[PDB]
Design a protein around this ligand. Structure first.
Ligand SMILES: CCCCCCCCCCCCCCCCCC(=O)OCC(COC(=O)CCCCCCCCCCCCCCCCC)OC(=O)CCCCCCCCCCCCCCCCC
Ligand code: HEA
Ligand code: HEA
Ligand SMILES: CCCCCCCCCCCCCCCCCC(=O)OC[C@H](COP(=O)([O-])OCC[N+](C)(C)C)OC(=O)CCCCCCCCCCCCCCCCC
Ligand SMILES: CCCCCCCCCCCCCCCCCC(=O)OC[C@H](COP(=O)([O-])OCC[N+](C)(C)C)OC(=O)CCCCCCCCCCCCCCCCC
Ligand SMILES: CCCCCCCCCCCCCCCCCC(=O)OC[C@H](COP(=O)(O)OCCN)OC(=O)CCCCCCCCCCCCCCCCC
Ligand SMILES: CCCCCCCCCCCCCCCCCC(=O)OC[C@H](COP(=O)(O)OCCN)OC(=O)CCCCCCCCCCCCCCCCC
Ligand SMILES: CCCCCCCCCCCCCCCCCC(=O)OC[C@H](COP(=O)(O)OCCN)OC(=O)CCCCCCCCCCCCCCCCC
Ligand SMILES: CCCCCCCCCCCCCCCCCC(=O)OC[C@H](COP(=O)(O)OCCN)OC(=O)CCCCCCCCCCCCCCCCC
Ligand SMILES: CCCCCCCCCCCCCCCCCC(=O)OC[C@H](COP(=O)(O)OCCN)OC(=O)CCCCCCCCCCCCCCCCC
Ligand code: CUA
Ligand SMILES: [Cu+2]
Ligand SMILES: [Mg+2]
Ligand code: NA
Ligand SMILES: [Zn+2]
Lengths: 46, 514, 95, 79, 43, 54, 227, 75, 58, 259
């Protein structure tokens, strides 16, 4: 049977707060920093 | 096990949680794109050199946060999280097709990013007006990837709309009729109907554009008998129904938030609300040429379309009056969702009223493709639907996850977001009235000051979104679960507990015999 | 010509087979029809079957109403819809 | 005659916003005059003002392209 | 929605370093790109 | 051929619907996911060489 | 022709767009009235102390709620169509001017008689005459007369441009294969500015339109001494 | 009339004899005239892009006897 | 009231009506069959028969 | 245990597999159009053919081999099929309205005449009238097959559905014949573009309908459709009547009127 509960209906690990902070900041920072890398690559290309 | 849950999913709650994750990712992507766009209009300069890459950034902003923030989060996440839970259905009628729609979304995101990646760039605005999007001004593989991204997003939205319509009409308890469902279910009913009655024109138009680019046809080349105004007609015949897609589940969420924390057991004038929303969903298809009052139409056509634009203006006013009359003498509790709702009502009202100012064709002759238009729709979209989605997420986050956000931090987020977005989008009224056109990387000196003010306001909104991650981290930094939920009787979604288990409605609801 | 196309009293298997078998007896244990025996009286409540000791009960307790009053119903004594007065008693003997 | 002409007048045939059909029909019935006075042998400059009005109406690129398609005998217009 | 108190407490100092870590992690690649564009323009 | 297939497909085993036949369903599942992930990786490599100009 | 801290419209020269200003002020009355009304209601009935959560009556306020926004929108729409049916009257075209939107620049044709056409480029920032403007200067200006109904026939080659001047209240999209007719009347001489109002690629922010309008004796002395 | 037999009759009397009659009639009409004179208008036989299959100038269902090429006919 | 019942009833049931059906069908079949076979024969021999070349020699 | 009467589905992979196969198909079109590669496109085609194959093999497995298809699930299926069919009605309405916009006001580069000068359309009396007769005869054939399913006679509906599939294949092969023997190409003006694009999607849709009829025929030869629960042929008949009414609209709008 599947596992249900608070934090157990999420794909990411919940039980450790600091690795959660690290993974959320790298995930949202990668999302934030993707268009900067795109625009610097078209600056480098042209 | 992990793959069989989060990749092979066949229940609506986990799939909706994945829409929350993907929509949050795309929201930060488009937030960064908006930071760039306001970032070199603070000071007049070619910070990015040519403005082809600026148009690439603007097109990316528009596409990712129309089709990749607001539609996934709103439609997919809130429908898959709430529509089975309000109506009592255990699941959707077609869960595998819903999962295919969700998993079709990240290839569309990947092809949009790859469309931005190619050195020509798809810098042609949100509308894909040919032959700027043709094979001579945009000779490359980028806009073909943009078209295929729109194909994947449209097919995912069509499959989701099919599942939504069949699970509202068919997956309902038997003695409950259509006029006992909560108003968010009606919102996604008319919304999914307009998706399925709008997206085939978009798909046909962009298939036509792809065939014009590659297979040497001339639907949009006037040298072989085509007409670009055919694309304008087809695109906006899709587009204003898509506009009311972007606004109508926001109306449903706002109605639930307003009737919830005010203590009302029943929103005022339910049949009036339902009539107004079906009136919007019926009048959304005959109004589209208000986007083309400067193209060269016949004057009788323009008079008819501005008349029909006021006829679509009246039921929205009926809805906002019924909101102010379902606040009538209620036990109001100042949760942050009410702060988002009051911000929605006032700022969506002023944005829509500037839309009514833009509606008259004679004034739209001079106020076309200026920042007055940008102020109108950035009000309505960028904070009406935005504050509706934060009202919904802050309200249903104990239901979604289990833990609660801090009320002080959420009200501080409302304050910083309110100040930021109002400072960003207030002075561009005066910019557009002064005559500053849209899609401009650099401007003359006289448009400088308001631009600078608005740009630093955007940075304020940037600070706002930081607090968002912080306060959701604060939830997982506190693990504070709920005691109980108020007004649990009139809402079925709160009544299975926070958060609901994997299999809800194992034995379904019991209906009154009458 | 021929026969060949089968009558669905033989090719019905599984959940389709028991819903057709029960439905042509007139009993619906899989919630396909609106139930009967409306009585909000104290001595004669609304009887609702169950397989667990807990069930959703919705009350559209006055005719042509917007909101359905949703509440959990538990095994034991019958308590009413919390605004109108229609009784509800759960009987957990339906598998 | 009408001439002492200054600028092409407002035609009642096309009162609306789009006026490409005006110069299209004007170039067409200019050539309809041209072959009409060719066929009947009349004076060709009786409807002289048609060239003045289609040079006043539609741009030089379109009339240059149309005259080039006359010059190679490849104009789909009814002439 | 009435909430139970926190099963894990959160003091001021870990909140402060959390918001500091979030802002520096969000601003160091964005500020890395925007801190220098003369190198990306091949000037 | 249908009623013995009805009796077969009500195994009450817990094996999922895509693996109800057993060995050839397992083989077909493996060969429809392995080359699909290979095609996905090939698509990412294809877009990566498409991104860098010549 | 903008100026810093401008909140309202660009000031009037054409009668069509000063009537547009009159209608703009009237609809600004309307939006101020209803925005102040909803602001007063929002700041009012959120600031009460009493509660009323009964099953109130519904069908007793909809007659005013239906007829009053219709009344407001019809007093909005009567001057709308009144001025909309006044920009398309019986034309008396003293002058016809064609323009055709080249790839990030313009061309203008004065060929009613004695054929004249020119291509208008942009003055660069580093090539500016002192005292001039940034992003709003053109070497070859568009010369028009005053007090006269003049038509613009617009077109383009490939991409969708838009000939737009807000001070005169003109904005029409330059489309290939379709010339559009836009009337213009001016009551003052001078130099009136506008920009592109449709996207046209990698220099879309870099084409201005400038209208120098002068009396007619300088038209003989100018068009007779230009080619 | 609650019967498949009227549709059976309607297939075997109206539908299949009708399609047989129009098939034979199209075989009577199966005579095609000679090709038109190659006049190169610029509003057709256009190439805004080389084609993505083979030569780049042949269409997908190209036939060399009725379908021209922008260079002209080919023999 | 179905179509094969009424087609049997008012056309095939009586023998005199059967013979009237046969005679009228014979006349219409003669005309249609003559047209069809003549058209097939002139298509197979396109340009070969005398009526195809009759117009050249007036 | 499930007490309600709905369908609970096992966790299936082919949503993800089909979505990534669609990614492979779109990228295959991109690289064939711009880089001349076929292998990735054929990989995407192979992936989504077997994906669709075993997804609907699964749907067959709960339908006729497990019997989870409750009548309310049948109502959901017929609602979804009606929604899908009005989706392509409105899709082809977009194509139609593009054709009417191109046709009713011709531009100055066509000569202002429909059809334009230099393009000679075939008159609709010989071949497209034959197409309309084929599709109408197939409509009477599927109505006969549906009513034979109503009565429950096997060999008659077998013959009817063989006739339907035979005329569907006859339709697509002689449509390929008129593609072979037309006087103009897809690059030959706006008339050629509109006509070939509309007829191309109609040919694609009738190929989908013929394949769906082949699938339901092979299902019925394996004794799947009963006298009441035979939703596969109901969806086949609905799609086929859709193809018939769409072809009637192409016959009127493109062939007979305006040409
Ligand atoms: C199960 C036991 C742990 C398994 C390993 C977890 C860590 C690696 C992993 O497989 O990680 C799993 C993946 C999950 O990603 C996917 O599944 C693909 C989605 C596209 O995590 C990510 O990629 C990053 C997610 C970080 C947290 C995001 C929080 C978003 C907050 C805002 C929305 C709230 C919604 C509430 C509702
Ligand atoms: C959700 C998004 C949203 C919403 C609701 C609207 C709503 C409206 N929009 Fe807009 N619109 C857009 C998104 C939206 N729009 C976008 C994205 C574009 C540009 C796309 C592009 O960039 O090309 C656009 C463009 C656009 C234009 C084109 C301007 C131009 O490009 O030149 C016009 C003009 O007709 C217009 C009009 C309207 C009108 C009249 C309404 C109305 O529905 C507003 C009604 C709302 C109200 C709140 C009514 C207020 C009424 C009361 C408060 C009651 C009292 C009233 C009386 C007493 C009368 N919109
Ligand atoms: C979804 C629609 C949407 C939204 C929200 C926005 C939001 C914003 N837009 Fe956008 N904009 C468009 C749609 C939108 N815009 C379109 C369609 C165009 C025209 C494109 C074209 O030219 O064709 C446009 C054009 C446009 C321009 C035109 C560029 C130019 O004319 O030169 C500019 C610049 O001022 C701009 C700025 C902004 C800013 C500063 C915001 C800010 O509001 C951004 C701040 C928003 C957020 C921070 C969202 C909150 C997100 C989160 C909280 C993360 C998600 C997580 C959870 C919800 C849990 N927009
Ligand atoms: C040689 C084939 C016909 C052999 C005879 C035959 O079957 O006749 C049909 C039938 C007998 O065949 P039957 O045995 O099928 O009988 C038919 C039965 N009823 C009449 C009830 C439908 O004979 C007749 O109808 C009478 C002969 C005349 C037919 C009409 C001729 C009209 C043209 C006259 C000129
Ligand atoms: C929006 C409006 C909708 C409704 C519109 C209603 C009217 C539409 C137009 C109808 C057709 C108009 C022309 C028809 C007559 C052509 C005459 C002609 O050219 O004849 C000489 C040509 C050439 O003559 P021929 O000599 O080669 O013909 C062969 C003759 N026989 C058969 C005897 C061997 O003949 C024909 O075109 C005959 C056409 C016969 C087929 C007609 C359709 C049959 C039924 C098909 C459907 C079946 C469903 C089951
Ligand atoms: C392109 C890919 C199309 C995929 C597709 O349509 O699959 C069929 C779809 C899924 O089958 P579904 O009914 O969801 O199965 C689970 C519950 N029976 O089937 C359905 O959702 C029902 C029929 C919908 C048809 C939609 C066609 C697209
Ligand atoms: C600066 C950011 C870190 C602040 C750390 C801090 O002082 O935390 C204490 C307090 C915790 O929040 P608390 O007031 O307990 O909860 C509100 C009730 N809903 O934090 C706060 O209330 C936020 C204080 C922010 C001060 C700026
Ligand atoms: C909130 C009110 C509704 C939204 C109005 C948005 C449009 C707008 O502000 O337009 C500017 C308007 C008219 O500007 P105007 O005062 O005429 O400028 C020239 C003479 N000073 O001027 C104003 O509305 C006044 C300045 C803003 C007040 C708030
Ligand atoms: C005088 C005629 C007139 O137009 O007055 C303006 C207003 C009533 O005109 P009406 O167009 O109906 O309303 C304004 C629409 N925004 O009428 C008024 O605004 C009333 C003006 C006289 C009374 C002023 C009282 C001010 C008290 C402080
Ligand atoms: C384009 C893609 C989409 C085409 C349209 C798909 C429409 C699907 C409709 C819903 C099908 C469905 O689930 O039907 C329910 C049925 C089970 O019910 P039933 O069999 O009636 O009951 C048991 C009887 N003992 O289950 C079934 O009948 C399952 C099988 C139905 C699907 C057959 C798929 C045929 C696909 C044909 C097109 C293939 C495309 C690729 C190849 C050609 C490319 C040009
Ligand atoms: Cu020309 Cu923008
Ligand atoms: Cu619109
Ligand atoms: Mg425009
Ligand atoms: Na800039
Ligand atoms: Zn009750």
């Amino acid at each position: 049977h599947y596992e249900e509960g608070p934090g157990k209906n999420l794909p990411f690990s919940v039980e450790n707060k600091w690795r959660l902070l690290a993974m959320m900041t790298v995930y949202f920072g990668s999302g934030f920093a993707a268009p900067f890398f795109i625009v610097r690559h078209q600056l480098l290309k042209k | 096990m992990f793959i069989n849950r989060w990749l092979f999913s066949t229940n609506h709650k986990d799939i909706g949680t994945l829409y929350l994750l993907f929509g949050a990712w795309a929201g930060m992507v488009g937030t960064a794109l908006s930071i760039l766009i306001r970032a070199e209009l603070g000071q007049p300069g070619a910070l990015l050199g040519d403005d082809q890459i600026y148009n690439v950034i603007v097109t990316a902003h528009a596409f990712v946060m129309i089709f990749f923030m607001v539609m996934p989060m709103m439609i997919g996440g809130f429908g898959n999280w709430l529509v089975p839970l309000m109506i009592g259905a255990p699941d959707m009628a077609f869960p595998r097709m819903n999962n295919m729609s969700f998993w079709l979304l990240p290839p569309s995101f990947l092809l949009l990013l790859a469309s931005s990646m190619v050195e020509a760039g798809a810098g042609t605005g949100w509308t894909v007006y040919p032959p700027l999007a043709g094979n001579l001004a945009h000779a490359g593989a980028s806009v073909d990837l943009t078209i295929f991204s729109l194909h994947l997003a449209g097919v995912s939205s069509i499959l989701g709309a099919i599942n939504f319509i069949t699970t509202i009409i068919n997956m309902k308890p038997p003695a409950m009729t259509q006029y006992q469902t909560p108003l968010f279910v009606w919102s996604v009913l008319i919304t999914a109907v307009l998706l399925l009655l709008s997206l085939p024109v978009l798909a046909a138009g962009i298939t036509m554009l792809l065939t014009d680019r590659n297979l040497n046809t001339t639907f949009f080349d006037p040298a072989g008998g085509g007409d670009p105004i055919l694309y304008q007609h087809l695109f906006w015949f899709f587009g204003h129904p898509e506009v009311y897609i972007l606004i109508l589940p926001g109306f449903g969420i706002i109605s639930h938030v307003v009737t919830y924390y005010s203590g009302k057991k029943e929103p005022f004038g339910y049949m009036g609300m339902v009539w107004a929303m079906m009136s919007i969903g019926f009048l959304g298809f005959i109004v589209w040429a208000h986007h083309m009052f400067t193209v060269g139409l016949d004057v009788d056509t323009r008079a008819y379309f501005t008349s029909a634009t006021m006829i679509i203006a009246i039921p929205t006013g009926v809805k906002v009056f019924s909101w102010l009359a379902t606040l009538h003498g209620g036990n109001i509790k100042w949760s942050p969702a009410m702060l988002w709702a009051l911000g929605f009502i006032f700022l969506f009202t002023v944005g829509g009223l500037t839309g009514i100012v833009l509606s008259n064709s004679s004034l739209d002759i001079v106020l076309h493709d200026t920042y007055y238009v940008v102020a109108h729709f950035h009000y309505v979209l960028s904070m009406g639907a935005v504050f509706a989605i934060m009202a919904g997420f802050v309200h249903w986050f104990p239901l979604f996850s289990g833990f609660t956000l801090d009320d002080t931090w959420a009200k501080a987020h409302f304050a910083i977001m309110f100040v930021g977005v109002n400072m960003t989008f207030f002075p561009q009224h005066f910019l557009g009235l002064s005559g500053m056109p849209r899609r401009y990387s650099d401007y003359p000196d006289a448009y400088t000051t308001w631009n600078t003010v608005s740009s630093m306001g955007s940075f304020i909104s940037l600070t706002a979104v930081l607090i968002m991650i912080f306060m959701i981290w604060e939830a997982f930094a506190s693990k504070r679960e709920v005691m109980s939920v108020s007004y649990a009787s009139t809402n079925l979604e709160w009544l299975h507990g926070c958060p609901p288990p994997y299999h809800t409605f194992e034995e379904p609801t019991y209906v009154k015999v009458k | 010509s021929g026969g060949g196309v089968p009558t669905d009293e033989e090719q019905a298997t599984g959940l389709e087979r028991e819903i057709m078998i029960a439905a042509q007896k007139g009993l619906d244990p899989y919630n396909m029809l609106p139930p009967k025996a409306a009585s909000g009286t104290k001595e004669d409540p609304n009887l609702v079957p169950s397989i667990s000791n807990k069930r959703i009960v919705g009350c559209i307790c006055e005719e042509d109403n917007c909101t359905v009053i949703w509440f959990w119903l538990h095994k034991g004594e019958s308590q009413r819809c919390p605004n109108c007065g229609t009784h509800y008693k759960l009987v957990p003997h339906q598998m | 005659k009408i001439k002492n002409y200054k600028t092409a007048p407002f035609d009642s045939r096309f009162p609306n916003q789009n006026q490409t059909k005006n110069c299209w029909q004007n170039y067409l019935d200019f050539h309809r005059c041209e072959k009409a006075m060719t066929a009947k042998g009349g004076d060709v400059s009786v409807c002289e003002w048609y060239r003045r009005v289609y040079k006043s109406l539609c741009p030089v690129s379109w009339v240059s392209a149309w005259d080039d398609r006359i010059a190679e005998g490849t104009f789909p217009g009814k002439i | 929605v009435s909430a139970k108190p926190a099963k894990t407490p959160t003091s001021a100092v870990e909140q402060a370093v959390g918001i500091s870590a979030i802002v520096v992690g969000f601003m160091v690649p964005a500020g890395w790109v925007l801190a220098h564009l003369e190198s990306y323009k091949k000037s | 051929k249908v009623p013995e297939l009805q009796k077969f497909f009500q195994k009450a085993d817990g094996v999922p619907i895509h693996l109800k036949r057993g060995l050839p369903d397992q083989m077909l599942y493996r060969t429809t996911m392995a080359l699909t992930l290979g095609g996905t990786i090939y698509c990412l490599i294809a877009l990566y060489m498409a991104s860098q100009p010549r | 022709m903008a100026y810093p801290f401008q909140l309202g419209l660009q000031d009037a020269t054409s009668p069509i767009m000063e009537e547009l200003m009159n209608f703009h002020d009237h609809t600004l009355m309307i939006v101020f009235l209803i925005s102040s009304l909803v602001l007063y209601i929002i700041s009012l009935m959120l600031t009460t102390k009493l509660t009323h959560t009964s099953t109130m009556d519904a069908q007793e306020v909809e007659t005013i709620w239906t007829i009053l926004p219709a009344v407001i929108l019809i007093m909005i729409a009567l001057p709308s169509l009144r001025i909309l049916y006044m920009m398309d009257e019986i034309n008396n075209p003293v002058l016809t001017v064609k323009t055709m939107g080249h790839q990030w620049y313009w061309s203008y044709e004065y060929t009613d008689y004695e054929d004249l056409c020119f291509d208008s480029y942009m003055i660069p920032t580093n090539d500016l005459k002192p005292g001039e403007l940034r992003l709003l200067e053109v070497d070859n200006r568009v010369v028009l007369p005053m007090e006269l109904p003049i038509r613009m026939l617009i077109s383009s080659e490939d991409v969708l441009h838009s000939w737009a001047v807000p001070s005169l209240g003109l904005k029409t999209d330059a489309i290939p294969g379709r010339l559009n007719q836009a009337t213009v009347t001016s009551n003052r001489p001078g130099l009136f500015y506008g920009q592109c109002s449709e996207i046209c690629g990698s220099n879309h922010s870099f084409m201005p339109i400038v209208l120098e309008m002068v009396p007619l004796k300088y038209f003989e002395n100018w068009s007779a001494s230009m080619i | 009339g609650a019967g498949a037999n009227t549709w059976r009759l309607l297939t075997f009397v109206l539908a299949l004899p009708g399609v047989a009659l129009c098939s034979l009639n199209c075989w009577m009409h199966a005579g095609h005239h000679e090709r038109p004179e190659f006049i190169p208008y610029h509003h057709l036989r256009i190439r805004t892009k080389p084609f993505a299959w083979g030569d780049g100038n042949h269409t997908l269902f190209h036939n060399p006897h009725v379908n021209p090429l922008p260079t002209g006919y080919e023999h | 009231p179905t179509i094969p019942s009424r087609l049997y009833s008012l056309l095939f049931r009586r023998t005199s009506t059967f013979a009237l059906t046969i005679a009228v069908g014979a006349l219409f079949f003669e005309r249609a069959f003559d047209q069809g076979a003549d058209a097939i024969y002139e298509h197979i021999n396109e340009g070969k028969l005398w009526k195809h070349i009759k117009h050249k020699y007036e | 245990h499930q007490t309600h009467a709905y369908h609970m589905v096992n966790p299936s992979p082919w949503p993800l597999t089909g979505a990534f196969s669609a990614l492979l198909l779109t990228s295959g079109l991109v690289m064939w159009f711009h880089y001349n590669s076929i292998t990735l496109l054929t990989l995407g085609l192979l992936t989504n053919i077997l994906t669709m194959y075993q997804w609907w093999r699964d749907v067959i497995r709960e339908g006729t081999y497990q019997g989870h298809h409750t009548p309310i699930v049948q109502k959901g299926l017929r609602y979804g099929m009606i929604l899908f069919i009005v989706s392509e009605v409105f899709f082809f309405a977009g194509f139609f309205w593009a054709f009417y916009h191109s046709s009713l006001v011709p531009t100055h580069d066509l000569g202002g005449c429909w059809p334009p000068t230099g393009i000679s359309p075939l008159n609709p009396l010989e071949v497209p009238l034959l197409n309309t007769s084929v599709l109408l005869a197939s409509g009477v054939s599927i109505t006969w097959a549906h009513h034979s399913l109503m009565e429950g006679k096997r060999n008659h509906m077998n013959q009817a559905l063989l006739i339907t599939i035979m005329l569907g294949l006859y339709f697509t092969i002689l449509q390929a014949s008129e593609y072979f023997e037309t006087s103009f190409s897809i690059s030959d003006g706006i008339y050629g573009s509109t006509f070939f694009m509309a007829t191309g999607f109609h040919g694609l849709h009738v190929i989908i309908g013929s394949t769906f009829l082949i699938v339901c025929l092979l299902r019925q030869l394996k004794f799947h459709f009963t006298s009441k629960h035979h939703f596969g042929f109901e969806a086949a008949a609905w799609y086929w009547h859709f193809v018939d009414v769409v072809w009637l609209f192409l016959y009127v709008s493109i062939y007979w009127w305006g040409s």
